[PDB]
Structures are given as C-alpha cells and as structure tokens.
Ligand binder design. Structure first.
Ligand SMILES: CCCCCCCCCCCCCCCCCC(=O)OC[C@H](COP(=O)([O-])OCC(O)COP(=O)([O-])OC[C@@H](COC(=O)CCCCCCCCCCCCCCCCC)OC(=O)CCCCCCCCCCCCCCCCC)OC(=O)CCCCCCCCCCCCCCCCC
Ligand SMILES: CCCCCCCCCCCCO[C@@H]1O[C@H](CO)[C@@H](O[C@H]2O[C@H](CO)[C@@H](O)[C@H](O)[C@H]2O)[C@H](O)[C@H]1O
Ligand SMILES: CCCCCCCCCCCCO[C@@H]1O[C@H](CO)[C@@H](O[C@H]2O[C@H](CO)[C@@H](O)[C@H](O)[C@H]2O)[C@H](O)[C@H]1O
Lengths: 108, 112, 82, 63, 226, 52, 160
C-alpha cells in the first residue's frame, strides 16, 4: 500500500549494508545485499533508459538528490557499485517525473 | 594485520583510505562536494538584485557544483543495461547468472 | 709500515689528503668572489650588497629576496625608494 | 686574516649605516603614498563634514 | 492492511546491516563474528583529560544535572581491527551518537544564561559525530573558498590542514581536544605568513663572516645552505 | 600608479579583516578588488566595462 | 584664486619632477623653486615641506649618530594633509619631548599628549634600582630573594 516508500527505504538500508560489509570484509553479506536490491521493479526498469538520456533541469535535480543520499564517488571500475548507483538514480528519476522534487527550503 | 589508526592519522585516512572490496575513487575524493549554502546564497543575491520571493523561487535552480558523474554510466551504457536486464530476470544474479555481463564490464574497465 | 690498528688513520688519510687540493681551491675561489664583490661595491651600486651573503639579487626592479619591488612603477622626489 | 678583518669592519660599519638609512627611506616612501591617498580621499567628504551624531545608514524603524 | 511489507528486505533476505544485527538476529553471515562495542564506548559523558588537572578522568560539571558515567576511550585495543575505516576508528575516541550530557531546559532564560556565560551551545550538546563524507564535503568546500580567496598564497594548504584536522577531531563536540591537535598547523600558518611578508617586502639582514670552526673537521664537507 | 596600488591594498586589508571566509560577500569583494589590481593602469571609463 | 591654485600645483609637480630627475645627492640645483613656493605657501596657507626635505637630504649624506630619525619623522609629519599629528616640543629644558596635538588625541591610545622624551635614558645604577624596586612592589611576590640552598663557603656569594 506504500510500495514506493517501502522500496526506497529498503534500497537505502541495503546500500548501507553493502558499505558496512565492505568495511568488514564480508563478501557473502555484500552479495546478499546486492541480490536483494529490488531489481524486479518495472517502473524503475522503464525509467532507466529515460534517465540515461535525460538532460538539463531534470538531470540536475536527480543528481542533487543522489548526491544528498550518496555523495561518495564510487570506483569507476566496480560494476556492482556502478549498477546500484544507476538503479537508485533511475528510481529517483521515476519519482521525479511522476511528482517533481522541490529541493529549496523557500517554497509556497 | 589491520592495526589501529591513531587520531593523528585520521586526516590522511579520510583521503587515502585502506583497501576494501568496495573502494571509492581516491583520486576523486577531493572532488566530492555538496553545498549547503547554494539556495541561501542564490536567494540573497536575487533579493539584493531586487527580485521578489516568488521571482526568486521561480528562478531558483539546483546546484551543478556537486560530485561529478561516473563516466561508466556513459561509456558502459549498453553493458550496464544488459546486466540490469539479466538481474531483473534472474533474481539479482543468484548462483552466478549475470557473471557473463559482469565479467565483460570488469574486463572493459580494468584491462588486467 | 702499517697494521690493523692503524686502519682508522689509513682510511682517514687516503680519503682526506686528496681533498686538500680541493679545499685550498675552494678557499681561493671564495677569496676571489669576495674581491670581485668588494670591487663592485667600490664601483657603486643602486641598492646595497650584503658581502657575506650567498646571493644578492637586488636591483632597481627586484627586492633583496628576488621578488619584484612594490610601488616601483613611478618616480619619487627623494630618488630611489631604498 | 687581521688585514681582512680590519677592512671588513670598516665595510660593515658603512653598510650598517646605509642599510638603516635605506630602510627609513622605504618607510618614508610608503607613508608619503598613504598621505597622497588620504589627500585624495578628503575631497570626497561632503561640504560641512560628516554628521557624526547620527548613523550614516538608518536600517530599520524605531517605534 | 499490514504496515511495511516491502520495506524490510533485510528481514526477508537474512541481510545484516552490521555485525551487531547479525549477532542479534542470528543470521550468521559475518565470517569473523562480532566484538561488541561496550556501553562505555557507545555512550557516556565528557571528561577531563590532562594529568595536570586535579579532576582528571572525572566528568565535566555543568549547570544542569547530568549523568557522570564517562565515555572510556579504547586504551588496549585488539591487534586485528579488521575495519580500519573512520567509522570504526572514531568509536575509539568519541561516541557516534554524541555524549549523554545534553540538557532539556525548563525555560528559555536558563538556556539564554548558560549560553551567555559560555556553558551551552547546541552545536556542541545536541549533535552527533560527523561522518567521513560530511567531513570531506566540508573540507573541500572550504578549500575551494580559500583557493578563490587567493591562489598565489603559500599558507593556503596549511590553513586547509588545520581545518581538516579540526573536522576530523570533531571540534564541534570536543573543541579543546581538537585545538590541542590543530594548533601545530596554526603555528605553521603563522610562520608562513611572516615568510611571505618578508619575501614580498624585501627584508634581510647583514650576515656575519664565516666562523673559524664552521666545519668541525677539515675532511668534513661544508654543505652550502641558502 | 603606486598610490593606486596602495589604495587597493588598503581596501583589500580592510575588507578582509571585516569579512571572514564564512561571509558571502567576501568572494565578490575580493574578486572586484583583484580586477582593480588587474586594471590599475587604466582609466575609470575603461575599467567600468571590465569590473562591472 | 583657482587659476593661481592650479598654477602652483603645476609648479609643485614640476619641482618634484626636477628633484626626482636630479636625485637626492644633487639637490642644490632646485633652489630655483623656493622663491616661488614660499610665496605660494604665504598666499594659499599651504605647506610644501621644503625645509624638511632639504634638511633630510643634507643630513642623510653626512649622517648623525641618530641616523636622522628626527628629520625623517619631521618630514613624515609635515607631508600630512591636515597637518602634523606628532611634533617635537620646544623647550628651555634640556631634554626635548615628543608631543601630540590635542585635536587628534582621540585617534591615539594615550592619557595625555606627552609621549615621553625623544632621547633614551642614561645608564644609572640609581634608575635601575628605582625601576627594580617599583616592579617588586607592583608584583608583591613573597619568595623573591629566598635562597633554599647555598654552597657552603666563607665567601658570602659563592661564584657570583
Ligand atoms: C695526614 C695528611 C695531612 C692532613 C692535613 C691535610 C689538610 C690540611 C688543611 C687543614 C686545614 C683545613 C681547614 C680547616 C678549617 C675549617 C675549614 C674547613 O673545614 O673547610 C674545609 C673542608 C670543608 O669544606 P666546607 O664544609 O665547604 O667549608 C667551607 C670551605 O671548605 C672553605 O670555604 P671555600 O669553599 O670558599 O674555600 C675555597 C678555596 C679557598 O682556598 C683556596 O682557594 C686555596 C687553598 C689551597 C692553598 C694552597 C697552599 C698555599 C701555598 C702558598 C705557598 C706557595 C709557595 C710555597 C709552597 C710551594 C709548593 C711546594 O679552596 C679551599 O678552601 C679548599 C680547602 C681544602 C680542604 C682540605 C683538603 C684536604 C682534605 C683532607 C685530605 C686528607 C688527606 C688524607 C689524610 C690521611 C690521614 C689518615 O673541610 C676539610 O677540608 C676537612 C679537612 C680535614 C683534615 C683531615 C686530616 C686527616 C685526619 C685523619 C682523620 C681520620 C678520619 C678521616 C676519614 C678517613 C680516615 C682514613
Ligand atoms: C689566490 C687567492 C688567495 C689564496 C689564499 C687562500 C687562503 C684562504 C683561506 C683563509 C680561510 C678562509 O676562511 C673563510 O673564507 C672567507 C675568506 O677567505 C671568509 O668568508 C666570509 O668573507 C668572504 C669575503 O672574502 C665572503 O666571500 C664569504 O661569503 C664570507 O663567508 C671567512 O672570513 C674566512 O674565515
Ligand atoms: C696591553 C696590551 C693589549 C694588547 C691587545 C691585543 C689585541 C688583540 C685583539 C685580537 C682580536 C681578534 O679577534 C678575532 O680575530 C679574528 C680574525 O683575526 C676574527 O675573525 C674570525 O672570526 C670571525 C667569525 O667568528 C670571522 O671574521 C672569521 O671567521 C675569522 O677570521 C674573530 O672574529 C675575532 O674574534
């Protein structure tokens, strides 16, 4: 009944778990985290190629939100990290194109 | 083996962290940025120019001075899309079902 | 002649008595550089020269530390700014 | 070495004198430039000077 | 209508967010197990540190009532500290959730008076530790601002280093402890300032002649220094 | 030109003591005074176009 | 008279240019201009630091043990637009004093206008004793002069 919210919070928890398991040297845990990351979402899958070709204001909004949630730059060589980043960005892109973000504190 | 890092060595630990299975881009760690003053500064400048609050909020735009984008998202586009298709079909790559695409990506990025 | 107990003196001699020509040459070069510096000073300079200093880069357009002089674009009634 | 030292003593005395006077001339140069700047600035003062009783900019009500 | 169905994949798939969760829920996906962070390192109060203080290893006294059980730093750590990231290192000197010495004021004038006398700042008392990402963001913004202020300045990276050390040492919550770490870089900046002023404004001195025994031994080399 | 340099140095010293790095107007002020330093050997009419 | 004011400003700039061209060694060439500059001064109420500049130039080539410090400060204070802030008091007393004008007293951190003598003190056992006694009284430290151990000797002060 709240799938978008639920899947968002789950994705964030799984990212945190991946980072912790990497720090603690735990391939089993971090692969479990990678596998449990909501890859079966049709909306995000449809929005992925749209994000990959978007440009301008929408892209800047989504980049701002992604840098808020995950400002660390992932290693350009690690495809698992790259893919989870892409997935999170596609999710945010879907949410933004349904209901755009309002990031300023000044608003009415 | 992994010995304690005293408090005096933490500034070097922040920009030269130890090795992990999931490392960041150490060369780009000085380039990660996120301005908490972006919108306040924008509003201050526009209100000093002479605009109203509504005009400022309509003219406001989000910061471009954030952490740069991964170049892999533009270079390895098709490979990443195929990997994500494989994952969506095969339940996150359980028991080594997206190893093909992941290994192709790894080779392309690393080159021995 | 020699002995194992004289290894200290043997090594020191072999390594140092060949250096004495170079030491005397260094001393002579230093005296000549001092002579030339004093002759230049007697001839005259815009800014002073420190005699016992390694390097003296000061001129009309350069500080005593190798940087450009501040406030040196115009001319001044009392002459040089130094 | 004694001859060299006598000559060096004379030279160092003269050099100390020159260095002191040079530093003081540099000081005077800078101060004269400051005086020129002040002379130019005093032209921008309004006729009758500044109203030192009030604030220059009144930036709010007093109710 | 159940609450939060799709929101606990950590529970559905037995994924632990940390070794403490792994140990608690018995998922057993951490090969190396878990050494629990004890309570004296998970929480506690600010203490005095110097041996030249009479109340050393005693809790700091405040106008308000506060638990006097202190945070104990890790003085005898284990050899293998598998996670050597800042996340696990910071717990040896500060508690991540902040200290337990914060007030809840019954009135606003008490807050005012404490601040006025220098015994309260919310920056200091209602706050957690900063994460490495936050520290890096702050440092990089400050570095950008300093570079914009002046590129042709020699004390630039020294100022950046004192800022970095304060942030890493968590000066928001332990300012005296952090200043104790960062005043060295402040001193180096203080030196660089004069070295730059004396290079800009040409300042030099009459050096004396060479000493008779500048070299201790004739066969020794007299390495020339500027 | 020497007195112009001195005036700009006075402006910079005063403004840098007044505004700290947390201040928002510091960067614009320093940039404007740096442009004045760049354009000392010029007239106000030519300097306006560049420093505006 | 604005015509005359501008003419005199031009004359002063010309004098400065000539003086700079000749240098501070050859300064007796520009005695031409004093004739007119003193008249400018008497007419417009202006000062041009002529005597001070000339005295400084003369002194720095045959310097004093003071190294011409009073000349330097005199020139610096003459060249101010609104007048000298700091001057050297004229006295029948032997030692001269540095004095500060009253109308600029609010710019300086002083209780009075007298900034002390313009020459350093003379060495005196009595003045040293006085200063040391005053400092001891102001400090008021019980423990000064206490000697917990002294080398055993017939001499009162062993060593010193
Ligand atoms: C048997 C051998 C012969 C024994 C006699 C030898 C001693 C002769 C001297 C006797 C006189 C000493 C003075 C006494 C008066 C009180 C003063 C005093 O006590 O202070 C000195 C000293 C304490 O010092 P102090 O507490 O700081 O007091 C203030 C200063 O001392 C003083 O104030 P100051 O610090 O400002 O003065 C500094 C400065 C001022 O003076 C000077 O600067 C100059 C002094 C040198 C003068 C040079 C001579 C002058 C020459 C001029 C002429 C030249 C031309 C002609 C000659 C040419 C030469 C050929 O220098 C001195 O004062 C130096 C003092 C020298 C102390 C004596 C050193 C000898 C120690 C004992 C040696 C024992 C040998 C073995 C014994 C074996 C027996 C079994 O006490 C002693 O020296 C103790 C002497 C005790 C004699 C013991 C005799 C043995 C008896 C057997 C007993 C058995 C038990 C012993 C244990 C082991 C047994 C097995
Ligand atoms: C053919 C030329 C003369 C041949 C004789 C060579 C013998 C000289 C050795 C004497 C010892 C020199 O040792 C040292 O060197 C030079 C002078 O030489 C001096 O050095 C000092 O004064 C000289 C001036 O000449 C400066 O150039 C130098 O920067 C300064 O350090 C020292 O005051 C002296 O102590
Ligand atoms: C009642 C009769 C009284 C008779 C008085 C006799 C006066 C004797 C005075 C000799 C003093 C010479 O003093 C000594 O000389 C040498 C050179 O010669 C100086 O020079 C020496 O040291 C300085 C640096 O330390 C340099 O110049 C150089 O390295 C070296 O040549 C010494 O700095 C000085 O200490």
């Amino acid at each position: 009944s709240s799938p978008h919210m639920d899947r968002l919070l789950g994705d964030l928890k799984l990212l945190a778990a991946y980072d912790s398991a990497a720090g603690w040297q735990e391939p089993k845990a971090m692969e479990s985290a990678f596998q449990s990351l909501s890859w079966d979402d049709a909306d995000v899958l449809k929005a992925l190629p749209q994000y990959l070709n978007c440009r301008g204001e929408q892209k800047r909004r989504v980049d701002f939100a992604y840098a808020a949630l995950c400002p660390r730059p992932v290693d350009e060589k690690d495809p698992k990290q790259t893919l989870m980043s892409l997935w999170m960005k596609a999710r945010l892109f879907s949410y933004d194109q349904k209901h755009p973000f309002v990031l300023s504190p000044f608003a009415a | 083996a992994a010995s304690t890092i005293p408090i005096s060595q933490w500034p070097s630990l922040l920009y030269a962290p130890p090795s992990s299975p999931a490392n960041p881009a150490v060369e780009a760690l000085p380039e990660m940025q996120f301005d908490d003053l972006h919108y306040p500064r924008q509003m201050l400048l526009c209100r000093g120019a002479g605009y109203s609050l509504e005009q400022c909020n309509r003219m406001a735009q989000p910061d471009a001075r954030v952490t740069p984008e991964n170049p892999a998202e533009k270079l390895l586009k098709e490979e990443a899309v195929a990997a994500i298709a494989c994952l969506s079909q095969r339940e996150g790559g359980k028991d080594e079902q997206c190893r093909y695409y992941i290994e192709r990506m790894y080779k392309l990025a690393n080159k021995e | 002649s020699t002995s194992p107990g004289l290894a200290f003196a043997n090594l020191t001699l072999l390594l140092d008595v060949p250096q004495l020509p170079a030491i005397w040459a260094v001393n002579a070069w230093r005296e000549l550089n001092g002579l030339f510096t004093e002759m230049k000073t007697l001839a005259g300079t815009s800014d002073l020269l420190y005699p016992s200093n390694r390097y003296n880069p000061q001129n009309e357009k350069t500080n005593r530390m190798g940087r450009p002089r501040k406030y040196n674009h115009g001319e001044w009634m009392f002459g040089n700014s130094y | 070495q004694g001859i060299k030292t006598v000559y060096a003593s004379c030279r160092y005395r003269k050099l100390n004198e020159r260095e002191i006077i040079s530093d003081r001339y540099t000081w005077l140069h800078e101060r004269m430039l400051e005086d020129e700047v002040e002379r130019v600035l005093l032209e921008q003062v309004p006729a009758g000077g500044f109203d030192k009783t009030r604030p220059g900019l009144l930036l709010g009500p007093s109710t | 209508s159940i609450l939060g169905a799709e929101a606990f994949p950590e529970l559905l798939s037995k994924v632990p967010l940390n070794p403490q969760m792994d140990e608690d829920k018995h998922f057993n996906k951490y090969k190396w197990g878990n050494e629990p962070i004890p309570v004296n390192r998970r929480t506690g109060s600010r203490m005095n540190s110097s041996i030249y203080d009479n109340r050393n290893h005693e809790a700091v006294r405040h106008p308000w009532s506060t638990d006097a059980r202190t945070f104990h730093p890790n003085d005898n750590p284990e050899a293998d500290r598998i996670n050597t990231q800042y996340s696990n290192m910071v717990s040896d000197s500060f508690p991540e959730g902040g200290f337990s010495d914060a007030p809840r004021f019954s009135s606003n004038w008490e807050r005012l008076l404490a601040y006025h006398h220098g015994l309260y700042s919310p920056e200091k008392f209602n706050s957690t530790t900063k994460t490495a990402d936050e520290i890096r963001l702050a440092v990089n913004d400050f570095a950008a601002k300093v570079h914009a202020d002046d590129p042709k300045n020699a004390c630039k990276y020294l100022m950046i280093e004192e800022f970095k050390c304060l942030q890493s040492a968590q000066a928001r919550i332990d300012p005296q402890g952090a200043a104790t770490k960062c005043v060295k870089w402040f001193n180096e900046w203080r030196q660089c300032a004069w070295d730059q002023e004396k290079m800009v404004k040409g300042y030099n001195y009459i050096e004396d002649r060479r000493a008779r025994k500048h070299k201790p031994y004739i066969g020794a080399p007299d390495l020339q220094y500027s | 030109v020497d007195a112009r340099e001195m005036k700009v140095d006075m402006y910079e010293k005063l403004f840098k003591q007044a505004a700290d790095l947390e201040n928002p107007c510091r960067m614009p002020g320093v940039a404007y005074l740096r442009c004045l330093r760049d354009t000392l050997t010029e007239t106000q009419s030519a300097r306006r176009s560049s420093c505006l | 008279a604005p015509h005359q004011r501008a003419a005199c400003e031009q004359l002063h700039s010309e004098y400065k240019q000539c003086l700079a061209k000749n240098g501070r060694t050859h300064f007796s060439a520009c005695t031409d201009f004093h004739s007119k500059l003193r008249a400018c001064e008497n007419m417009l109420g202006t000062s041009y630091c002529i005597d001070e500049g000339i005295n400084l130039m003369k002194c720095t080539k045959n310097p004093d043990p003071s190294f011409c410090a009073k000349e330097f400060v005199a020139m610096r204070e003459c060249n101010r637009p609104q007048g000298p802030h700091l001057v050297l008091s004229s006295s029948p007393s032997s030692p001269p004093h540095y004095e500060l004008r009253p109308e600029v007293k609010h710019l300086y951190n002083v209780d009075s206008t007298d900034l002390g003598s313009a020459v350093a003190p003379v060495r005196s056992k009595e003045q040293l004793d006085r200063v040391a006694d005053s400092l001891k009284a102001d400090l008021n430290l019980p423990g000064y002069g206490h000697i917990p151990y002294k080398w055993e000797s017939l001499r009162p002060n062993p060593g010193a």
